[PDB]
Amino acid sequence: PGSIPLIGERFPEMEVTTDHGVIKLPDHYVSQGKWFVLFSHPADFTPVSTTEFVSFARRYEDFQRLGVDLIGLSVDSVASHIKWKEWIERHIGVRIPFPIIADPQGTVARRLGLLHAESATHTVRGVFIVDARGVIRTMLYYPMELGRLVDEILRIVKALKLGDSLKRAVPADWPNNEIIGEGLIVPPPTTEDQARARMESGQYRSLDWWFSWDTPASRDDVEEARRYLRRAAEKPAKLLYEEA
Amino acid sequence: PGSIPLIGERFPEMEVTTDHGVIKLPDHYVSQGKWFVLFSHPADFTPVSTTEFVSFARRYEDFQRLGVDLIGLSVDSVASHIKWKEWIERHIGVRIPFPIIADPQGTVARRLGLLHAESATHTVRGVFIVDARGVIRTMLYYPMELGRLVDEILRIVKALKLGDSLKRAVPADWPNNEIIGEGLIVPPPTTEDQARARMESGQYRSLDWWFSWDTPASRDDVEEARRYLRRAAEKPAKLLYEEA
Amino acid sequence: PGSIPLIGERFPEMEVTTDHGVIKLPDHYVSQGKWFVLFSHPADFTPVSTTEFVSFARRYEDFQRLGVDLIGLSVDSVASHIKWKEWIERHIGVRIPFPIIADPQGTVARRLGLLHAESATHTVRGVFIVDARGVIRTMLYYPMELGRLVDEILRIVKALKLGDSLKRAVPADWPNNEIIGEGLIVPPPTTEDQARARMESGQYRSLDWWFSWDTPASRDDVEEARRYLRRAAEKPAKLLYEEA
Amino acid sequence: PGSIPLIGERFPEMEVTTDHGVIKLPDHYVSQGKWFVLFSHPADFTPVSTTEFVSFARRYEDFQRLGVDLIGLSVDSVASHIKWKEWIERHIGVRIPFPIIADPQGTVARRLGLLHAESATHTVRGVFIVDARGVIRTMLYYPMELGRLVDEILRIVKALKLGDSLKRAVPADWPNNEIIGEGLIVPPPTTEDQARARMESGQYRSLDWWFSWDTPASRDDVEEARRYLRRAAEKPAKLLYEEA
Amino acid sequence: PGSIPLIGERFPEMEVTTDHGVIKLPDHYVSQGKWFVLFSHPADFTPVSTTEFVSFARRYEDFQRLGVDLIGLSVDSVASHIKWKEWIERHIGVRIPFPIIADPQGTVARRLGLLHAESATHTVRGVFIVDARGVIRTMLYYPMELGRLVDEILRIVKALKLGDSLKRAVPADWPNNEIIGEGLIVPPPTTEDQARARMESGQYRSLDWWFSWDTPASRDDVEEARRYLRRAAEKPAKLLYEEA
Amino acid sequence: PGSIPLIGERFPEMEVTTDHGVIKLPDHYVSQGKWFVLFSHPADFTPVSTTEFVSFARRYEDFQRLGVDLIGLSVDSVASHIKWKEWIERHIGVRIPFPIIADPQGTVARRLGLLHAESATHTVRGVFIVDARGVIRTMLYYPMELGRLVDEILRIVKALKLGDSLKRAVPADWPNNEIIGEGLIVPPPTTEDQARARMESGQYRSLDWWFSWDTPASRDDVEEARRYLRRAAEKPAKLLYEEA
Amino acid sequence: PGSIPLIGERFPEMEVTTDHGVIKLPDHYVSQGKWFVLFSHPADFTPVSTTEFVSFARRYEDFQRLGVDLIGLSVDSVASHIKWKEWIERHIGVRIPFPIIADPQGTVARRLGLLHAESATHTVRGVFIVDARGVIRTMLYYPMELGRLVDEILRIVKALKLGDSLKRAVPADWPNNEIIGEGLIVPPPTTEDQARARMESGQYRSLDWWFSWDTPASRDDVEEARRYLRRAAEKPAKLLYEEA
Amino acid sequence: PGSIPLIGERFPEMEVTTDHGVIKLPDHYVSQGKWFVLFSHPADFTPVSTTEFVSFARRYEDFQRLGVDLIGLSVDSVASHIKWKEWIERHIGVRIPFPIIADPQGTVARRLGLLHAESATHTVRGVFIVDARGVIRTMLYYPMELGRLVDEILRIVKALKLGDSLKRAVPADWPNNEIIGEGLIVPPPTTEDQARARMESGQYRSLDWWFSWDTPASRDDVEEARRYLRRAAEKPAKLLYEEA
């Protein structure tokens, strides 16, 4: 009972107003050869949303390294965005370096299907992962009551970029897959002839003609991907509330 | 674009055929007081899909301890589902204990908006997290080329059940939030009088009238959630490909 | 209350995916000067469907003598086609040399009217006999519970090619017709002048101006068509289940 | 294309005029506990159609023994039907005992989808096999130029009646299937529990959990069916044209 | 409650199949400088229809002398047309020289409004008199139960051609009109001035300015028309059933 | 084209104004159990129309002997009808005893399809022969330029009433049919059993099972019909224009 | 209600048939510089209508002197018009010199809105006063039971023509207006500046800035207008019925 | 263009505001057994409209003698109506006793078809003469530039009232008709029988069966109607502008 963009579709053409200026999506990021993560939050001056902005902000360098820009979205106006980012910097001591789209008539929210039954007026916690051709690669929709795991967004972009560069599919829980560990999967044969040639070539470890894998990711790519999940699993060293 | 069910809507009433029999969604799970994760995969005898079924099966008791049932979906017929599950048990040594929906005309797929531009004929890797009242709580759309992180699905269900039980919102990266750690958020005041009373009462740690939290989750609640993320982060000691 | 292509119509233009690759119908066969028989079955790993695939396979050389190619169709995906053909070769000892169309959204099933009331999701046992101009010559619709008589499909193609080459119509039960045996029927006069000319010429055996025939089929043609029927009538020497 | 009735549908309700009187289909046969074969031919005083009427008449007692009534169909009027059947009895020495529907405006032809691209005005050679509950079980569409094999129509009815009676599916080319001969197939299991139970039980010969069979058809049932096919295969002893 | 062509309209353009070949109406007759009488009959091998075909055949030479051709029409096929005309030649001793249209799907009948409430499936006894410009000049609709008076069709054609060449209207019962006998009527004045000039001229016998006549038809034209009516009135010298 | 009522339909329910008063058709004549002939003419004070009114008036006793009432129709008003009937009585010496419908807006004309392409404003010379049940039995459409043969209207009513009262069909040109003279046709058999019973019986003179006749009409019936045609064929003894 | 043309619109473009010929309105009069009065009457040989035609005829030269032509209209045909005009000349001794439109399908009547609730089939007594540019200037609708005052139609046309020529409005009851007698009204000022200038100029007799008049109509124009009204008021010396 | 109500229709039901208050039409007058004349004028403070109001007011007692009330209409509001009537009494010396409808949005004007092409904003000079049953009897449409002849409106009511009470039609120019003078016309016969009875009764003076009259109006009634026309034709004794 609501309409969304689809994986494999170009991100919808739109002019949006941010607290950094007016930009065209997705062209502004395509032009720079950058991926972007567009994520939404119900409203400014809400606590879960503030935790999520701080989490994105502390991982900013990790996104920069992957060649990924971040852009937020809520139904609030630019002035609230500026006051809210100023509060976070002053009260939590973390600067929010990325822009937030101001969507007061919910024009962007409706276009991206971010108004769910949980609220008629405020956007759910949507995530659009968009590559440097402007194509939607992955979408997540978290609810109002539950913050995102930002390290999984890093792992998705890392794995997707590795998949594209090595021409491989990525197993469940990569790089900690229980069957093939850090293995990456060769796209299966699509014909009788290709299945026979694959089962005869010896080129790849195989469980069957449709299930072949090798280990072409560098130790560095594998350990970078693992470090995202290690950070997600670590009890924080010192809580930001104690000095605030 | 394309049309989906939404967060906060009841899962659409539908009768589906599984390799376990015919069932009505969501009633089959609601009538048992169980949550269910419905997840889709493009086709049987595909390699990423196999790794994901084995990750789900490995985490099956973790799901059951939460009162969460699993149910798969592809456009394959039940005979293929039975052959594929027999192949996994025989070649990987892992029984798939949960059912798979057979959706040969894409009826269920079209209803849950699981056909994206990547494939006209096979579902993407959708995830629907549905509570024991039959309400959609969270939705994930992974693409063909990228397997899911199943421990994030366990983290979502655990955190949602804690939120429901303790009347709290869950911060980013819980239970390892950089600001408040394993802290849970008190839903913010919605009026001037509630805001004033909150800032006067001294009942909760606060950064402002709209950002209050406490630590009401049991040690075992927190450790269960940390265990899911530690498993996501750890390289497995034994790869299952090496058993065959 | 369902729609079909019709005898005398060109086979609908369509791209289909098979376990041999992607082909245009009917162009792929028209370009080789070949007839094709497109037949459908409900699902892979079904027993009647297996018997019919083995029946087609054993008669493969008979279809190649007539210049006919075979092409199957079900709603199953390519991977299941490949595992099912592998299963037939391994357990029955019979190679299936011809392709199977994979039709998971029933796009082809709906174009050809192969979804009947017996199943909303699986095709009935359709047979389209298509000549080397890509024209539909004969259509059969067998149900789920009843396998085809493949020797009748051979007799239909042989008789059609014979009618086409000799400019003749083919009587009931040819070449064992009770009135004229292996005789072929001259197309009847369509005018008073033609009717009178026919009745006066004595060129043909006649029962009346509208019922004339001769015996222009070679003894090879007659005996090859009769051999199809003798094979259909004979108790097999040895059942394939015995050596398997 | 053009619309047709479908396998598993009730034969469309209709009153028809035949050279025996006015009847309601399918009720006239359902109320007698009888199956019927409705078949069509392009026009009266056509030679292929004449050969088929004589083939049906010769097999009339075989159809009566199965509890099957025959009813023909063309766009001609009753008076042509009567003159043509008199011509057949007088000139071929064969009485046509069964009625022919007269369908001059093509009302019945359009309802049954019997007008194909080959003729705008005359029906092709359709066959509708309808059980004693008024349900369409099988449909054949033969073209103008090609007479039917009437013994296949007996084998279809015989096979269908055994399938219904013994709760079995019928293999390819029964009762001469190359894999199981006169064997009939047990409906395959539809669930994991049913598949495991079938393969533990040892009640039936099997090639796999989905492919079980036994030989419950009487000697008399099998010999009746082989007799239809033997007659199809054997050159007739005396041709009717001779004494004419 | 049925739609017809109209007097003064061109006969609707159409391709029809006859027992003489395929022709375009009205072009086939216009090309030859001919009028035609198209007449319909319910079905072949019907007795009133047989009496009409014999009456038309007996008057055929009279039609030809007038530059008029005859064409029949029923919902029967060409093969029935040919058998029926042969039956008439053989049993009545009268050759039917003119073609019959075969209209099995009632395309022609429906275009011409020949399907009345008396029969849903068979044409009434319609008559279309069409001149050499292909314009409909007169239309008669006789029922199933009542044969036509063919001599009145001859009188109508003769009187129209006389009216056309002589620029005259034809009185009731011409050439035996009770007021003016074989007189023909001068088209009445359409203005006061023409009325006054008519009354003043004394050029014609008149009863009033609107009722003038003269006698410009030749003795031969008048004798020809009286012959049609004397033939209609006289009991035949010998009955064709006696000679049969 | 245009629209008409049809043979076998009840005459359309309508209230009409005549120079005798306002009546319901066909109720006014049904309610007296009388047949009626409704006939149309273009306009009052037109010469052909005048000749037809005089012809109908001369035959008024013959119509009354058959229990048939006459009613005219034109687009003129009642005052013009009355002045035109007075002019006929005054100048031709013949009283018009039957009413004329006044149809100034062409309401009746459009309902009976009497406006053809010869005139957008004036009716052609339509004839509707309606029985005592209000059923249309025969329809004639003569053009502006050609007066009707009123004796053929008498022959039609006479033969229709004979057909109704004897259960017979009436051959072409009755009672001067070339094959059977004054003979009347027995409705043909409609079934195989009736056809055989008819051929075994010898109750009737027969040419075949479908062509039987007897002579059940009284001499008075036959001679009255022949009288109408003899009157049509007779040179008038004395022209009314001379008598004036 | 019903649709009418309006004062200030061009008379609807139409071709009409009269007892003088076929003409186009309003072109036929515009091309002559003529005004026309089109008037309707319910039917020919009606007494009020006859009185109006004689009244128009008696004033024909008064209309001609003003450059106004007359044209009548009824749903009668031309022959009835000619006969009715003949009757008036012969029985009343007055020639009707002007044409009457014949409108048998009420095409003109419907276009001019002349069918009111008093009669569904006959026009009321409409009057369209049309100027030499073809523009409707005035419309009167008298009922069936009331003849027009033809001298008021002369007053209207005379007054409209003086107003056009002298650029003046015509007071109530001109030329015997109780306030200003034969005075004509100056079109009132339309601005504050024009009002002041008119009150200052002393150029006209005035009651206020909006009520100014002068006496620019000739003695001859005034006496003609008074002659029309004097004639309307005068009891005729001799009645035409007594000279009949 | 432009819809109006019609002669023979009930005046449309409406609530209207006047300078005397709110009244329902036509009920307000039907209740009192009174005719009314509703008339319209373009605008208050316009010269021709002022002359008409004065003419109506001078003839007020003549209207009251006939039991006719007067009601005006313009698109002006009540205040302009009161100021304008006040101006007429003060400057011309004539009290306006009847109400004026205020129609500022042209609601009443559109309902009565009073907006013609001559002004999109101001009403033409419409007159509805409505009888005591509330039926529209006559309608006049005078233009902006031309005042009405109010004595003709008196003549119409008088003649209509006379015709109703005496059951007579009124000749042109009554009571000064040039054929029958003050005679009134008997409604013509509508049937042949009625026409003959009228022609033989000698009861009325006649010119033909359709034109009969007598002199049943009182001498008072005739002279009162003639007075109205004498007043219209009289050069006024003294002009009101001199007594300004």
PDB file of N, CA and C in Angstrom, chain C residues 3-5 9-14 106-114 128, chain D residues 1:
ATOM      1  N   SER C   3      -7.427 -17.364 -23.291  1.00  0.00           N
ATOM      2  CA  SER C   3      -7.101 -17.035 -24.706  1.00  0.00           C
ATOM      3  C   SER C   3      -5.877 -17.844 -25.179  1.00  0.00           C
ATOM      4  N   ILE C   4      -5.852 -18.217 -26.466  1.00  0.00           N
ATOM      5  CA  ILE C   4      -4.773 -19.029 -27.101  1.00  0.00           C
ATOM      6  C   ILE C   4      -4.396 -18.439 -28.455  1.00  0.00           C
ATOM      7  N   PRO C   5      -3.187 -18.756 -28.965  1.00  0.00           N
ATOM      8  CA  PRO C   5      -2.875 -18.539 -30.373  1.00  0.00           C
ATOM      9  C   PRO C   5      -3.752 -19.538 -31.147  1.00  0.00           C
ATOM     10  N   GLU C   9      -2.217 -19.008 -37.593  1.00  0.00           N
ATOM     11  CA  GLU C   9      -1.482 -17.810 -37.123  1.00  0.00           C
ATOM     12  C   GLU C   9       0.006 -18.129 -37.020  1.00  0.00           C
ATOM     13  N   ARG C  10       0.832 -17.130 -37.311  1.00  0.00           N
ATOM     14  CA  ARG C  10       2.267 -17.163 -36.971  1.00  0.00           C
ATOM     15  C   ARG C  10       2.390 -17.292 -35.448  1.00  0.00           C
ATOM     16  N   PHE C  11       3.263 -18.188 -34.999  1.00  0.00           N
ATOM     17  CA  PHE C  11       3.633 -18.378 -33.579  1.00  0.00           C
ATOM     18  C   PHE C  11       4.018 -17.009 -33.020  1.00  0.00           C
ATOM     19  N   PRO C  12       3.494 -16.610 -31.855  1.00  0.00           N
ATOM     20  CA  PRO C  12       3.756 -15.273 -31.325  1.00  0.00           C
ATOM     21  C   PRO C  12       5.256 -14.984 -31.197  1.00  0.00           C
ATOM     22  N   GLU C  13       5.692 -13.845 -31.736  1.00  0.00           N
ATOM     23  CA  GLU C  13       7.067 -13.317 -31.576  1.00  0.00           C
ATOM     24  C   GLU C  13       7.405 -13.218 -30.085  1.00  0.00           C
ATOM     25  N   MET C  14       8.479 -13.855 -29.637  1.00  0.00           N
ATOM     26  CA  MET C  14       8.889 -13.776 -28.214  1.00  0.00           C
ATOM     27  C   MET C  14      10.333 -14.227 -28.062  1.00  0.00           C
ATOM     28  N   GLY C 106       5.367 -16.930 -15.737  1.00  0.00           N
ATOM     29  CA  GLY C 106       4.271 -17.440 -16.588  1.00  0.00           C
ATOM     30  C   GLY C 106       3.978 -16.507 -17.749  1.00  0.00           C
ATOM     31  N   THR C 107       4.947 -15.664 -18.128  1.00  0.00           N
ATOM     32  CA  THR C 107       4.835 -14.689 -19.245  1.00  0.00           C
ATOM     33  C   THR C 107       4.535 -15.479 -20.522  1.00  0.00           C
ATOM     34  N   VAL C 108       5.343 -16.494 -20.818  1.00  0.00           N
ATOM     35  CA  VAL C 108       5.121 -17.377 -21.996  1.00  0.00           C
ATOM     36  C   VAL C 108       3.843 -18.192 -21.752  1.00  0.00           C
ATOM     37  N   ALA C 109       3.631 -18.727 -20.547  1.00  0.00           N
ATOM     38  CA  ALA C 109       2.451 -19.591 -20.270  1.00  0.00           C
ATOM     39  C   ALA C 109       1.162 -18.834 -20.638  1.00  0.00           C
ATOM     40  N   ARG C 110       1.093 -17.543 -20.306  1.00  0.00           N
ATOM     41  CA  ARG C 110      -0.118 -16.704 -20.479  1.00  0.00           C
ATOM     42  C   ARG C 110      -0.281 -16.329 -21.963  1.00  0.00           C
ATOM     43  N   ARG C 111       0.810 -16.069 -22.674  1.00  0.00           N
ATOM     44  CA  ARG C 111       0.790 -15.733 -24.113  1.00  0.00           C
ATOM     45  C   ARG C 111       0.211 -16.913 -24.904  1.00  0.00           C
ATOM     46  N   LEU C 112       0.508 -18.133 -24.481  1.00  0.00           N
ATOM     47  CA  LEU C 112       0.134 -19.354 -25.225  1.00  0.00           C
ATOM     48  C   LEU C 112      -1.109 -20.010 -24.619  1.00  0.00           C
ATOM     49  N   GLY C 113      -1.732 -19.409 -23.610  1.00  0.00           N
ATOM     50  CA  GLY C 113      -2.965 -19.927 -22.984  1.00  0.00           C
ATOM     51  C   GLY C 113      -2.761 -21.295 -22.355  1.00  0.00           C
ATOM     52  N   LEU C 114      -1.622 -21.523 -21.701  1.00  0.00           N
ATOM     53  CA  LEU C 114      -1.301 -22.851 -21.118  1.00  0.00           C
ATOM     54  C   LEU C 114      -1.689 -22.923 -19.634  1.00  0.00           C
ATOM     55  N   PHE C 128       2.204 -27.329 -29.238  1.00  0.00           N
ATOM     56  CA  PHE C 128       2.153 -26.473 -30.444  1.00  0.00           C
ATOM     57  C   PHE C 128       3.089 -27.075 -31.492  1.00  0.00           C
TER      58      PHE C 128
ATOM     59  N   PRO D   1      -4.881 -14.061 -31.702  1.00  0.00           N
ATOM     60  CA  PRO D   1      -5.385 -15.109 -30.786  1.00  0.00           C
ATOM     61  C   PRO D   1      -6.928 -15.193 -30.739  1.00  0.00           C
TER      62      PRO D   1
END
